[PDB]
Each structure stands twice: as structure tokens, then as C-alpha cells.
């Protein structure tokens, strides 16, 4: 509640396929919690007309990337979003540009 589970862009346990049906323009992102068999979190976004599906794990109780460790998912989002650095994973890069906000 008093944290990640409040964030306008965080859709709780959203299924993989649904999440892809919520992206309209490249740079579209939204976070949800592991669905095949629940555990951690995923970053789903569109780039080039095809979603990418990034994982988010607490390096030390935080949440990390291919070169950085944050405090949480919320911290990860602003670093890339605000600052505008594309998450690069395996030569591929996903630009967080517009959160696909929960409908309310």
C-alpha cells in the first residue's frame, strides 16, 4: 500500500498478454508482478512495435539493472524516466517515456 503498490503505473498482478494490449505508442510502460507463477516484478514496454519484458530484482533489498542498484521499483522508474536514460539490456534499449496509468 504505502509504497510501490500505489503508483499510477503499477497495475498489480497484470497478465503478460493483457499488458501488451495496453501499449499503443513506443515508450509505453507499465509494471506488474510476476504472473506465470508470482514472485518479483516486470517492466513491460513497447519499442519498435514489439514489447520487451524486463525483470526487477532487489540487489540488496532494492531493485537493480545491468549496471545499477536502486532502493525500489519507484526509484528505478524516475532515474530512467526523469533523467531520460534508456534501459539497455542485451544491446536492446527500452525508453521509459509515458506511463500507461491505471484507469481511475
Domain that holds residue 78: 1-104
Q: Which residues, in sequence order, are bridge partners of residue 44?
A: 30, 53
Q: What is the CATH number of the domain that holds 94?
A: 3.30.505.10
Count up the domains in the chain and report the number: 1
How far is residue 60 from each of residues 56, 69, 91, measured CA to CA in Å? 12, 8, 25
Q: How was this structure determined?
A: X-ray
Task: List, in sequence order, the alpha helices (H) in 8-96.
Answer: 16-20, 73-81
Measured CA to CA, the distance from residue 26 to residue 2 in angstroms comes to 30
Measured CA to CA, the distance from residue 101 to residue 67 in angstroms comes to 27
> Please, what is the Cα angle at 100 between 96 and 104, to 5 degrees?
150
Amino acid at each position: 500500500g504505502s509504497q510501490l503498490r500505489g503508483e499510477p503505473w503499477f497495475h498489480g498482478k497484470l497478465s503478460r498478454r493483457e499488458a501488451e494490449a495496453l501499449l499503443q505508442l513506443n515508450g509505453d510502460f507499465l509494471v506488474r508482478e510476476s504472473t506465470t507463477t508470482p514472485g518479483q516484478y516486470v517492466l513491460t514496454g513497447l519499442q519498435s512495435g514489439q514489447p520487451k519484458h524486463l525483470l526487477l530484482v532487489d540487489p540488496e533489498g532494492v531493485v537493480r539493472t545491468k549496471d545499477h542498484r536502486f532502493e525500489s521499483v519507484s526509484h528505478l522508474i524516475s532515474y530512467h524516466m526523469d533523467n531520460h536514460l534508456p534501459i539497455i539490456s542485451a544491446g536492446s534499449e527500452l525508453c521509459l517515456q509515458q506511463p500507461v496509468e491505471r484507469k481511475l
